[PDB]
């Protein structure tokens, strides 16, 4: 047993293993220990895959790098391409034209919406929603609930809900339950009434239908989704407004705006209201577990500047908060060797000296798969992993030595802190947060006949509910932003600026003989960076530190735990053989394990 | 009905994401897919084993990603064991095996030089089963659903080319019906990004387009319900459906001997 970051870790209790963790991207194992009353007292995050993409890049052309690193992940597709082109542009002192900037921002914000909404409905919802209880719902009373939760949503009739319920009952009676087979349905961990469950299942189906339209924005600008094309120096999608021969003309831009408008409707009428409703009911049940590090230490690089290349105009302004002091946002510099560092003390890699964290410009990725002395099982048949030694393919990133949570919640905490200190670019997330708190505390309880509560944003936000809420709010904000970006794009083109690529430094004969650069992105899951060194036209070093690397990290040299492990601590389980609460909290980070290990 | 069991090795999950973009069709009992299942851990593992017994030699195994042979196979761990062990176990009683995407078909990005995990395509590990390769990074959504639909309608694998790819989707090179072909035929090329030629949609050969040596349905079926494809949106094909495309030189280096095409 030992104490770290206010958490009293203890492994003497009953060990529980979850391998595979399902409804994530990629491969993860989780182990916990519970006390005599089934409360988690120890938690162990293991990334169970590695591909070695950083080493594969060595010796290749920096201009090709984006396509390789894009294949780190097909879920957060393109965010690695963006980080890569930004890193190469930073190394080579390349400034992209306005239209390329706006198109990249539209693509980024489209990914944010798609990733957030599909995650919630496709992967997260079943941790909160009992699908078998939806079968016991009254279609009339489900229709009445839909009017209270979101009056503007047109899909609301009793008959609409009744038809959905029948096809669910048919699928269920078939005997082929498919993805619902052997679920944890009927656990006391589920608290929603039948009508709220049927409503959620219905919106699941709407989300899965509509998500294929949203990504057509990537297809226009980038050729395909997943894995749209990017370009060092700009975008490949050249413009000619008024002709059908260029990649982008007015008709294609009108198509993009139609897709954006659809996104705005879905976020405000379906997604945000559902999360507010589910959040309220779980708050009423007292389920405010899962805060972990969000209560103390959060980080994001900052993103979406109003004015290209002017970080003071970031619409999701970043930095670092420590010790839960929201009145003091520290600035974060990706270039500073004493700020972002990665340890491998408890990871399956080796450094010359593993008591030191390496800034990614000096990063090293040399595998070392070895299991500690206290392992139960063998090298190829693990029964119980030994977290006192090396236990994950994920490295351990820290900021000035501190363990941080990253992601939409971190961004929303940072935005709120910035707004409090006078920042005028964070007004919208602040408004969203205050609206959401009033709904969760007062308006929704009033409408459902529940007691009003008085939780502050400082109490609500650092929780699994809060982490889920911030994602939905971020989706809404991203759709609003890209709607504005679209207008600015069309206005700039109509005024006569059609430029999409700066090719002045395309030829490697123009490059400095050595250079280093960093590109950062506010990716869906948090703070993404790519650090590159270029020597004689080739990649000399390429290191990625990815949001799920931060959140899913194993312990560091000092033994400090990362966000996943912290978030599971101190949580009761209804039934230690059913990982309902573990999955609910882990899924609130939207874990991407391929991203985490690359 | 024939169940489809979907396994995941070393992968980025693009093929799974592509599959859910299909418009036509939007049939199976997807009784195992780790990315979708309600159950986790031991309960997910148990679901897998019940289906294999009940439908012996009458389920389809679909594989996304690939197995690593380095690190004693523990660079991809499922249920505390190497992925290759799960792959071989499930393959043994499958009626047919689908290798989704370039990862399962050939290796894809993790198999690019120097391949630190010795990632190996499915057909090099499973050698005694009917396999179909569906390459691409990822494949087109309608190609993936088209393959499954054929197999479920007809209870057999469709006609394959010598490389194991379905002729119904991989018989043509991109360059055969690419809409920029008349420009290629007239010597009309982009030379620099966003040049006048690029704004007129001229051929991308001199910008590195690998369409002339790449078999896929991208120029006709196109992507995301026929919205666009790489070339239409202005970037050359990078060859993503062809074996070893990451190690065929820079994506921006042109093919040699233009007259061949
Ligand atoms: S080289 Fe590429 S862009 Fe040109 S016609 Fe062939 S496939 Fe199309
Ligand atoms: S890069 Fe791939 S998606 Fe098609 S146009 Fe070329 S085969
Ligand atoms: Cl390949
Ligand atoms: Mg890394």
User: Rg of chain A's alpha carbons, rounded to an integer?
Assistant: 24
Q: How many domains does chain B have?
A: 2
Of B38, B82, B194, the CB nearest to A380: B82
For residue B79, CA distances in Å to A23, A366, B64, B156, B246 come to 15, 25, 18, 32, 31
Residues B129 and B205 in one domain: no
Say which DSSP state A21 is in.
P
Query: B246 CB less than 6 Å from ligand 2?
Result: no
Of A24, A68, A239, the CB nearest to B199: A239
Residue bearing the CA closest to ligand 1, atom 4 = B203
Q: Give the 3-state secondary structure percentages of chain A, helix then strand then coil, rounded to 5.
A: 45, 15, 40
Token couple for B198: 């690029």
CA distance A106 to A519: 18
CB-based burial, B61-96: b 16+ in 10 Å, e otherwise: bbbbbbbbbbbebbbbbbbbbbbbebbeebbebbbb
Mutate to test the interface with A, among B26, B34, B38, B112 (most CBs of A within 10 A): B38
Token couple for B93: 């009683």
Token couple for A336: 């500073």
Which residues have CB less than 5 Å away from ligand 4 (the ion)?
A 544
Which chain B residues are closer than 8 Å to A121 by Cβ? none
Token couple for A36: 């005599």
Token couple for A134: 């939806």
Say which DSSP state B92 is in.
T
Cis peptide before A169, with omega less than 30 degrees from 0? no
Token couple for B79: 């249920």
Candidates A228, A150, A45; CA nearest to A596 is: A45
Residues B114 and B16 in one domain: yes
Of B11, B29, B45, the CB nearest to A594: B11
Any bridge partners for residue A539, and if so which? Answer: A534
B164 φ, ψ (degrees, to nearest 5): 90, 15
In chain A, residues preceding a discontinuity (C to N beyond 2.5 A) are: 242
Residues B164 and B185 in one domain: no
A193 close to B50: Cβ distance less than 8 angstroms: no
| Burial of B219 per CB tally in 10 Å (0-12, 13-18, 19+) | buried
Name the residue in chain A with its Cα closest to that of B138. Answer: A226
Query: B48 CB less than 6 Å from ligand 1?
Result: no
Domain of A424 in residue numbering reads as 1-598
CA distance B175 to B238: 13
For residue A432, CA distances in Å to A470, A502, A511 come to 9, 38, 45
Q: Give the 3-state secondary structure percentages of chain B, helix then strand then coil, rounded to 5.
A: 35, 15, 50
CATH of residue A412's domain is 1.10.645.10
A229 φ, ψ (degrees, to nearest 5): -80, 145
Residue with tokens 């392992």: A375
CATH of residue B238's domain is 4.10.480.10
Residues B41 and B59 in one domain: yes
B246 φ, ψ (degrees, to nearest 5): -70, -20
Residue with tokens 């201009």: A63
Residue B223 three-state SS? strand
User: Rg of chain B's alpha carbons, rounded to an integer?
Assistant: 20
B186 close to B230: Cβ distance less than 8 angstroms: no
B110–A56: do the CB atoms touch at under 8 Å?
A: yes
Candidates B225, B84, B196; CA nearest to A209 is: B225
Token couple for A147: 């009017």
CA distance A444 to A148: 8
Instruction: Tell me how crowded residue A151 is: count the other CB atoms within 10 A of its CB.
Output: 10
A551 φ, ψ (degrees, to nearest 5): -70, -40
A20 close to B38: Cβ distance less than 8 angstroms: no
Q: Return all residues near A83 (Cβ < 8 A) that are at least 6 apart.
A: A69, A519, A520, A521, A523, A528, A529, A530, A544
Cis peptide before B145, with omega less than 30 degrees from 0? no
B178 labeled binding residue? yes
B200 close to B163: Cβ distance less than 8 angstroms: no
Query: A223 CB less than 6 Å from ligand 2?
Result: no
A385 close to A375: Cβ distance less than 8 angstroms: yes
- The experimental method is X-ray
Candidates A587, A564, A592, A298; CA nearest to A468 is: A587
Q: Return all residues near A424 (Cβ < 8 A) that are at least 6 apart.
A: none
A286 close to A279: Cβ distance less than 8 angstroms: no
Say which DSSP state B159 is in.
P
Element (H, E) at B47: helix B41-54
Which chain A residues are closer than 8 Å to B230 by Cβ? 223-224, 229
CA distance A385 to A373: 10
Name the residue in chain A with its Cα closest to that of B26. Answer: A209
A512 close to A489: Cβ distance less than 8 angstroms: no
Token couple for B193: 């990004």
Residues B98 and B220 in one domain: no
Residue B225: alpha-carbon gap to chain centroid: 18
Q: How far is B85 from chain A (nearest CA, A)?
A: 10
A221–B201: do the CB atoms touch at under 8 Å?
A: no
Say which DSSP state A421 is in.
T
Residue A152 three-state SS? coil
A525 close to A548: Cβ distance less than 8 angstroms: yes
Residues B174 and B230 in one domain: yes
Instruction: Tell me how crowded residue B1 is: count the other CB atoms within 10 A of its CB.
Output: 12
Residue-level length of chain A: 598
Say which DSSP state A267 is in.
I
Any bridge partners for residue A533, and if so which? Answer: A516, A541
In chain B, residues preceding a discontinuity (C to N beyond 2.5 A) are: 26
A442 close to A283: Cβ distance less than 8 angstroms: no
CB-based burial, A446-459: b 16+ in 10 Å, e otherwise: eebeeeeeeeebee
Q: What angle do CA A264, A267, A271 make, to 5 degrees?
A: 165
Of A23, A55, A377, the CB nearest to B116: A55
Token couple for A590: 């939207």
A483 close to A264: Cβ distance less than 8 angstroms: yes
CB-based burial, A528-550: b 16+ in 10 Å, e otherwise: bbbbbbbeeeebbbbbbbbbbbb
Residue B26: alpha-carbon gap to chain centroid: 19
CA distance B67 to B91: 13
Instruction: Tell me how crowded residue B59 is: count the other CB atoms within 10 A of its CB.
Output: 24
A554 close to A394: Cβ distance less than 8 angstroms: yes
Residue with tokens 């499973």: B126
In this structure, the dihedral spanned by the alpha carbons of residues A520, A521, A523 and A527, taken in order and rounded to 10 degrees, is 40
Say which DSSP state A361 is in.
G
For residue A333, CA distances in Å to A339, A422, A518 come to 7, 21, 10
Residues B29 and B151 in one domain: yes
Token couple for B234: 């202005």
CA distance A374 to A315: 48
CA distance A316 to A304: 6
Question: Is A49 within 8 Å of chain B by CB?
Answer: yes
Instruction: Tell me how crowded residue A352 is: count the other CB atoms within 10 A of its CB.
Output: 8
- CA A543 – ligand 4 centroid, Å: 5
| Burial of A149 per CB tally in 10 Å (0-12, 13-18, 19+) | buried
Question: Is A56 within 8 Å of chain B by CB?
Answer: yes
Residues B220 and B235 in one domain: yes
B10 φ, ψ (degrees, to nearest 5): -75, 125
Any bridge partners for residue A522, and if so which? Answer: A527
Residue with tokens 């230690």: A576
For residue B238, CA distances in Å to B52, B138, B242 come to 39, 12, 9
B108 labeled binding residue? no
Token couple for A152: 């503007």
- Which of B131, B154, B169 terminates a domain? The answer is B169
- Which of B109, B134, B169 terminates a domain? The answer is B169
Strands (E), chain B: 4-8, 30-33, 60-64, 77-78, 81-82, 96-100, 131-134
Q: Return all residues near A422 (Cβ < 8 A) that are at least 6 apart.
A: none
Residue A264: alpha-carbon gap to chain centroid: 19
Residue A63: alpha-carbon gap to chain centroid: 27
A445 close to A280: Cβ distance less than 8 angstroms: yes
A22–B75: do the CB atoms touch at under 8 Å?
A: no
Query: Ligand 2 pocket: which of B17, B181, B214, B221 to mutate (most atoms <8 Å of CB)?
Result: B214
Candidates B7, B86, B93; CA nearest to B52 is: B93
Domain of B69 in residue numbering reads as 1-169
Say which DSSP state A357 is in.
P
B233 φ, ψ (degrees, to nearest 5): -85, 0
Residues B74 and B46 in one domain: yes
Residue with tokens 């490949």: A236
Residues B146 and B250 in one domain: no
For residue A326, CA distances in Å to A99, A294, A458, A468, A571 come to 36, 11, 9, 20, 25
Name the residue in chain B with its Cα closest to that of A380. Answer: B81
In this structure, the dihedral spanned by the alpha carbons of residues A301, A306, A310 and A315, taken in order and rounded to 10 degrees, is -30
Q: How far is A425 from chain B (nearest CA, A)?
A: 33
- CA B149 – ligand 2 centroid, Å: 23
CA distance A333 to A325: 20
Name the residue in chain B with its Cα closest to that of A114. Answer: B17
Cis peptide before A20, with omega less than 30 degrees from 0? yes
Q: How far is A419 from chain B (nearest CA, A)?
A: 37
A223–B78: do the CB atoms touch at under 8 Å?
A: no
Q: How many domains does chain A have?
A: 1
- Which of B114, B149, B169 terminates a domain? The answer is B169
Query: Would you list the DSSP string of B169-186?
Result: HHSSBHHHH-TTHHHHHT
CA distance A78 to A225: 9
Token couple for A422: 């006078």
CA distance A521 to A523: 5
A63 close to A507: Cβ distance less than 8 angstroms: no
Token couple for A17: 């293993």
Instruction: Tell me how crowded residue A510 is: count the other CB atoms within 10 A of its CB.
Output: 11
CATH of residue B28's domain is 3.40.50.700
Token couple for A201: 């299942």
Residue A29 three-state SS? strand
CA distance A114 to A204: 13
Residues B66 and B185 in one domain: no
Candidates A462, A388, A550; CA nearest to A6 is: A462
Residues B165 and B179 in one domain: no
Token couple for A251: 């008709």
Instruction: Report the first-to-last Cα separation within chain A, whole angstroms.
Output: 32
């Amino acid at each position: 047993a030992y104490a770290t970051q206010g958490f009293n870790l203890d492994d003497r209790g009953r060990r529980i293993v979850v391998d595979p963790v399902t409804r994530i991207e990629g491969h993860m194992r989780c182990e916990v220990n519970v006390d005599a009353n089934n409360v988690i007292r120890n938690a162990v995050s293991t990334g169970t895959m590695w591909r070695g993409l950083e080493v594969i890049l060595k010796g290749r052309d920096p201009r090709d790098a984006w396509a390789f690193v894009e294949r780190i992940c097909g879920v957060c597709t393109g965010c690695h391409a963006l980080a890569s082109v930004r890193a190469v542009e930073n190394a080579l002192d390349i400034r992209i034209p306005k239209n390329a900037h706006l198109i990249r921002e539209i693509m980024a914000k489209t990914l944010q919406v798609h990733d957030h909404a599909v995650h919630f409905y496709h992967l997260h919802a079943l941790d909160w929603v009992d699908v078998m209880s939806a079968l016991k719902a009254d279609p009339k009373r489900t229709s009445e609930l839909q009017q209270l939760v979101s009056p503007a949503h047109p899909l609301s009739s009793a008959g609409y809900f009744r038809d959905i319920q029948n096809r669910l009952k048919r699928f269920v009676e078939s005997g082929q339950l498919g993805p619902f087979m052997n679920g944890y349905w009927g656990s006391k961990a589920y608290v929603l009434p039948p009508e709220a469950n049927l409503m959620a299942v219905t919106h699941y189906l709407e989300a899965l239908d509509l998500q294929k339209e949203w990504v057509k924005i990537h297809t226009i600008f980038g050729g395909k989704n997943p894995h749209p094309n990017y370009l060092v120096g700009g975008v490949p999608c050249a413009i000619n407004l008024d002709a059908a021969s260029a990649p982008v003309n007015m008709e294609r831009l009108s198509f993009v705006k139609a897709r954006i408008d659809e996104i705005i409707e879905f976020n405000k009428n379906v997604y945000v209201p559902d999360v507010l409703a589910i959040g309220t009911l779980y708050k009423q049940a007292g389920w405010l577990y899962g805060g972990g590090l969000a209560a103390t230490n959060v980080l994001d690089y900052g993103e979406y500047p109003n004015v290209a290349y002017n970080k003071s105009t970031d619409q999701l302004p970043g930095g670092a908060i420590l010790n839960g002091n929201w009145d003091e946002v520290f600035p974060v510099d990706p270039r500073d060797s004493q700020q972002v560092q990665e340890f491998v003390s408890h990871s399956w890699y080796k450094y010359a000296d593993e008591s030191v964290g390496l800034h990614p410009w000096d990063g090293v990725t040399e595998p070392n798969y070895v299991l500690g002395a206290n392992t139960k099982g063998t090298r190829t048949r693990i029964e119980q992993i030994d977290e006192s030694a090396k236990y994950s393919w994920i490295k351990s990133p820290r900021w000035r030595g501190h363990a941080m949570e990253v992601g939409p919640l971190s961004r929303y905490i940072l935005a709120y802190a910035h707004a409090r200190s006078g920042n005028k670019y964070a007004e919208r997330p602040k408004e969203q947060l205050e609206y959401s708190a009033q709904m969760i505390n007062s308006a929704i309880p009033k409408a459902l006949g529940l007691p009003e509560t008085q939780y502050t944003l400082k109490q609500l936000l650092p929780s699994t509910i809060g982490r889920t809420l911030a994602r939905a709010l971020e989706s809404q904000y991203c759709g609003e932003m890209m709607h504005s970006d679209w207008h600015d794009l069309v206005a700039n083109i109509r005024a006569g600026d059609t430029a999409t690529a700066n090719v002045d430094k395309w030829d490697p004969a123009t490059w400095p003989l050595q250079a280093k650069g960093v590109g950062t992105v506010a990716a869906p899951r948090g703070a993404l960076g790519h650090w590159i060194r270029i020597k004689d036209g080739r990649i000399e070093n390429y290191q990625c530190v990815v949001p799920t690397t931060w959140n899913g990290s194993p312990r560091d040299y000092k033994g400090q735990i990362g966000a996943f492990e912290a978030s599971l601590m101190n949580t009761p389980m209804v039934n230690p053989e059913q990982p309902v609460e573990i999955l609910r909290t882990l899924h609130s980070f939207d874990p991407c394990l391929a991203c985490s290990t690359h | 009905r024939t169940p489809v069991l979907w396994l995941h090795g070393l992968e980025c999950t693009c093929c799974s994401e592509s599959f859910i973009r299909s418009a036509h069709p939007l049939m199976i009992s997807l009784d195992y897919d780790d990315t979708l299942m309600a159950a986790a851990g031991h309960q997910a593992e148990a679901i897998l084993e019940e289906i294999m017994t009940k439908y012996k030699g009458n389920y389809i195994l679909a594989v996304e990603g690939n197995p690593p042979l380095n690190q004693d196979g523990m660079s991809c761990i499922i249920g505390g064991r190497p992925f290759i062990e799960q792959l071989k176990y499930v393959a043994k009683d499958a009626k047919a095996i689908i290798s989704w995407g370039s990862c399962a078909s050939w290796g894809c990005v993790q198999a690019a030089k120097p391949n630190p995990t010795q990632a190996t395509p499915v057909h090099k590990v499973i050698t005694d089963k009917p396999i179909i390769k569906v390459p691409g990074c990822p494949p087109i959504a309608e190609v993936m659903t088209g393959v499954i639909t054929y197999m479920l309608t007809f209870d057999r694998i469709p006609e394959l080319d010598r490389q194991g790819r379905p002729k119904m989707f991989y018989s043509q090179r991109i360059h055969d019906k690419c809409y920029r072909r008349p420009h290629f035929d007239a010597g009309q090329f982009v030379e620099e990004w966003d040049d006048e030629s690029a704004r007129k949609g001229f051929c991308l050969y001199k910008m590195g387009c690998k369409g002339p040596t790449t078999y896929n349905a991208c120029s006709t079926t196109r992507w995301n319900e026929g919205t666009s494809f790489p070339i239409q949106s202005g970037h050359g094909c990078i060859g993503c459906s062809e074996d070893g495309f990451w190690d065929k030189g820079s994506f921006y280096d042109r093919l040699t001997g233009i007259s061949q095409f």
